[PDB]
């Protein structure tokens, strides 16, 4: 039962919680062995693991649709923000072996802090699909959510944002010293400035273009 | 008696043969879940549907999954019908309701087909092209160290708490590589 | 037979719980000393008496040092 929950919160719906791609993890079955109010608890708890499925579906399809190495950097950070949600699910089954009195309320308690991470990062995963972002403007759209309002989503995106800057130090290292561009395709011509984030001013970009063009001569 | 006792006690053998398996447990639903679910189904008037899932204990599932992810064939669990390895739906543990089990064994059978087709390709050179030969040699070189990692994990089962969800995240930096 | 050794296991984990309650109240006992303290209290004795005993015995090894 309390391991049956631990597979519901993972990617195994089973017969008790019937997954649907319009509203998943449903229970409307009657239980002589569970209390009538218990359903209510599970219903609130149902909001958590559902999102963990949906994020997971988003990581499977990616890596004429969307393309880019930018999408190969948001996803990698979404792995690391889910890593403590792996660890704090491995801890529960260790705790359940000896103690038989650990009910559902301790799982609701211990994973209460993922009812603030998940809903504030799901708007970020919905935002890139409702409006398509495939260039270098992903850093602005994530960078306005890292300011956030709440401390978990404030750090969780900064972990993602560092690697998005890191892939931008492979283009701005090959161009400026070795005179190499288009070794990896984007999304004389040397243009990148339109998709560059607006908190990066024009002066540093006009410096970068001249330094890159001087290596060719 | 003398030899049949040494067999019956110390060797597992009940479930991969035609024999009803007896297994004591600590009842009361949290791991008695399959029996409670069957009691609810029969109390709700099915009518009969005499389901016969023989039984297995949990750890034996872990070791057969590891032997399938290795690349060796011929195991009791995981029947296959056209060359693609799929779940055997003849089994129950004491829990997992036969639906969570049917999903998780399907997910690892998906990687089982990945390793099975590539070992079939590796077998079709072992019984003359000289670049295909180098390619399959590269895959063989990856595979031998991979099988070393799972084989050392299997030795730690004979001796920590291990379940299915632990070994899949343990093989995560390699099952991503196998795809 | 079998339960008589798992019962004393069920003594050990309670004996570990009191090892937390001892250190969060800053007591001079260690784990070996507390075992003797449970053997004292099962037979029945005022713990104010034992506490006065240890409150003198602890001051009779650092008053000579």
């Amino acid at each position: 039962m309390i391991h049956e929950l631990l597979l519901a919160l993972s990617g195994y719906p089973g017969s008790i919680f019937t997954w649907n791609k319009r509203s998943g993890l449903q229970v409307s079955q009657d239980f002589p062995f569970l209390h009538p109010s218990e359903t209510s608890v599970l219903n609130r708890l149902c909001r958590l693991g559902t999102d963990y499925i949906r994020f997971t579906e988003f990581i499977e399809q990616y890596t004429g649709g969307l393309h880019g190495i930018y999408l190969r950097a948001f996803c990698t950070g979404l792995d690391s923000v889910l890593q403590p949600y792996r660890q704090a699910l491995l801890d529960l089954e260790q705790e359940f072996l000896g103690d038989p009195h650990l009910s559902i309320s301790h799982v609701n308690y211990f994973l209460d802090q993922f009812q603030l991470l998940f809903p504030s990062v799901m708007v970020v995963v919905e935002q890139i699909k409702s409006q398509k972002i495939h260039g270098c403007q992903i850093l602005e759209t994530v960078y306005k959510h890292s300011c956030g309002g709440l401390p978990p989503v404030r750090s969780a995106l900064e972990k993602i944002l560092a690697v998005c800057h890191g892939v931008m130090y492979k283009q701005l290292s090959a161009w400026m010293l070795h005179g190499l561009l288009l070794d990896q395709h984007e999304e004389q011509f040397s243009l990148r400035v339109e998709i560059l984030p607006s908190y990066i001013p024009v002066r540093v970009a006009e410096k970068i273009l001249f330094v890159g063009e001087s290596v060719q001569m | 008696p003398d030899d049949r006792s040494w067999l019956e006690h110390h060797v597992v053998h009940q479930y991969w043969t035609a024999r009803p398996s007896q297994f004591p447990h600590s009842l009361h639903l949290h791991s008695n879940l399959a029996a409670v679910w069957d009691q609810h189904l029969y109390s709700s008037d099915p009518l009969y549907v005499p389901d016969d899932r023989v039984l297995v204990t949990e750890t034996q599932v872990i070791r057969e999954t590891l032997w399938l992810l290795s690349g060796v064939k011929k195991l009791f669990i995981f029947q296959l019908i056209d060359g693609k390895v799929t779940v055997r739906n003849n089994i129950i543990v004491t829990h997992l309701t036969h639906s969570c089990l049917r999903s998780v064994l399907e997910q690892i059978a998906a990687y089982g087909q990945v390793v099975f087709r590539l070992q079939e390709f590796i077998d079709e050179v072992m019984g003359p092209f000289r670049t295909y030969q180098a390619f399959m040699w590269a895959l063989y070189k990856y595979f031998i160290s991979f099988k070393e990692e799972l084989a050392e994990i299997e030795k730690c089962i004979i001796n920590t708490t291990i379940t299915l969800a632990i070994v899949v995240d343990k093989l995560a930096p390699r099952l991503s590589q196998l795809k | 037979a079998a339960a008589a050794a798992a019962n004393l296991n069920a003594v050990r984990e309670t004996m570990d719980v009191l090892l937390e309650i001892s250190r969060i109240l800053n007591t001079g006992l260690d784990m070996e000393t507390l075992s003797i303290c449970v053997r004292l209290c099962e037979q029945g004795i005022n713990p104010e008496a034992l506490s006065s005993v240890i409150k003198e015995l602890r001051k009779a090894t650092e008053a000579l040092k």
């Binding site: 089954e93 000896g98 038989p100 | 297994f23 600590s26 791991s31 708490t161 | 798992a6 075992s35 449970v38």
Partner: peptide, 23 residues
């Protein structure tokens, strides 16, 4: 005596098909 004997190492084999006291 019993509590001098208490100090042996705990078991590392846990059962999930036995949730109440699996040594």
């Amino acid at each position: 005596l019993w509590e001098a004997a208490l100090t042996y190492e705990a078991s590392k084999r846990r059962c999930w098909e036995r949730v109440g006291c699996p040594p």
